[PDB]
Amino acid sequence: IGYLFGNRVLVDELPLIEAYYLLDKGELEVYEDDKEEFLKKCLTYDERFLIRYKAYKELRDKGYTLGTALKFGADFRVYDIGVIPKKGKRSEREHSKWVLYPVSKDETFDFYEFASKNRVAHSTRKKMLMGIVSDKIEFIEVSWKKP
Amino acid sequence: MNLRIPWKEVYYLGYNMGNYIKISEPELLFVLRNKPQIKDRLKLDEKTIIKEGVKKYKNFWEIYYTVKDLILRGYRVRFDGFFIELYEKGIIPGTIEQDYLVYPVSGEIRMTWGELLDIYNKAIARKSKFMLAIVDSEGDVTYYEFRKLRSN
């Protein structure tokens, strides 16, 4: 039901991460002209795709809803379980409730990077959400104490 | 180091061993700088303690600055060799469990994410809340509390 065109999949356009989720779940078929095929293309575009996807799939399966947080410089914003992106005139905290940084367990960072990640979360009145990825995935919520 | 001095007179830093206080170099630097009477009383040198401290801990200035920040805010603390134990305002160390275990770092320190989680898991194994303390080049400190996410 989908057509791959550059870094979007057109259905009825979707980012590659959302199209991969549905293909992996079984409610989407893709096609270049006319799966390891689509993943290879996704990784060509985004080297961190698997890192981002593993975290993304994890939370969306658990009932969380994710949207882009690029305007803030983060990978995803994350609404709590029982959701509801839209709500009314808001206002369940508005892009609400965690800024998510999918990250590899073997990736290095300095604490300038750490402080930066928390500062942008703080600037949106959210809660920095760090999701370490390896064989397993662990989600760490960081709060700015004062102190 | 082992000082034969009343515990209250070293800001309740270190461990009261009964007959003496067992106190680390970064904690002692704070007491020497803010209670200079102790220098002549107990015969200790500021520069010497820095020297012994920076070869013992890596890490030393960040412990010092974090200890200093927390005592000057009205808390009671002690360095356990790895974490700073942080106690709520009013209470003396060892009376009850600490509120937080805090790990002090500088900005320049480079670490793996799995290694940061190990440090956090170490505080969890101690059944305690964890707080990261990042100390800048002016010695000012910012604190970040960690929690695992799960409803479930």
**A136 and A70 fall within a common domain:** yes
- Distance CA(B68)–CA(A9), nearest Å, equals 56
User: Which of B54, B55, B56, B79 minimizes the C-alpha distance to B133?
Assistant: B79
CB-CB contact of B33 with B14 (8 Å): no
Q: After which residues do gaps appear in chain A, with C to N over 2.5 Å?
A: 12, 34
B1-152: in CATH 3.20.20.80: no
Note whether A141 contacts B109, CB cutoff 8 Å. no
**A72 and A100 fall within a common domain:** yes
Method for structure elucidation: X-ray
A132 in contact with B, Cβ within 8 Å: yes
Q: What angle do CA B125, B129, B131 make, to 5 degrees?
A: 115
**A25 and A80 fall within a common domain:** no
- Distance CA(A92)–CA(A87), nearest Å, equals 7
- Is B14 exposed, middle or buried, given 0-12, 13-18 or 19+ CB atoms closer than 10 A? buried
- Distance CA(B9)–CA(B23), nearest Å, equals 12
- Is A125 exposed, middle or buried, given 0-12, 13-18 or 19+ CB atoms closer than 10 A? exposed
Which pair of tokens denotes residue B136?
């800048």
A64: left (phi over 0), alpha (psi -120 to 50) or beta: beta
Listed in order, strand segments (DSSP E) in chain A are 3-5, 8-10, 14-15, 65-69, 74-79, 99-104, 108-110, 128-133, 137-145
Q: Backbone phi, then psi, for B70, in 5-degree steps? A: -70, -40
**A7 and A54 fall within a common domain:** no
CA distance B107 to chain A (A): 4
From chain A, the residues in CB contact with B112 under 8 A are 105-109
- Distance CA(A50)–CA(A21), nearest Å, equals 11
**A42 and A52 fall within a common domain:** no
Looking up residue A54, the CATH number of its domain turns out to be 3.40.1350.10
Which value in Å is the resolution of this experimental model? Answer: 2.1
**A120 and A96 fall within a common domain:** yes
The rounded Cα B88 to chain-centroid distance in angstroms is 14
CB-CB contact of A53 with A39 (8 Å): no
Which pair of tokens denotes residue A101?
């940084």
CB-CB contact of B77 with B13 (8 Å): yes
For chain A, how big is the Rg over CA atoms in Å?
A: 16
- Distance CA(A24)–CA(A65), nearest Å, equals 17
- For chain B, the domains span 1-152
User: How do strand B100-106 and strand B84-87 relate by DSSP bridges?
Assistant: antiparallel
CA distance B59 to chain A (A): 14
Q: How many structural domains does chain A have?
A: 2
**A32 and A43 fall within a common domain:** yes
CB-CB contact of B44 with B32 (8 Å): yes
- Distance CA(A74)–CA(A103), nearest Å, equals 11
Q: Which domain holds residue A106?
A: 48-147
Nearest residue in chain B measured CA to CA from A101 = B113
Catalytic residue list of A: 79, 95, 126
**A58 and A102 fall within a common domain:** yes
From chain A, the residues in CB contact with B109 under 8 A are 110-111
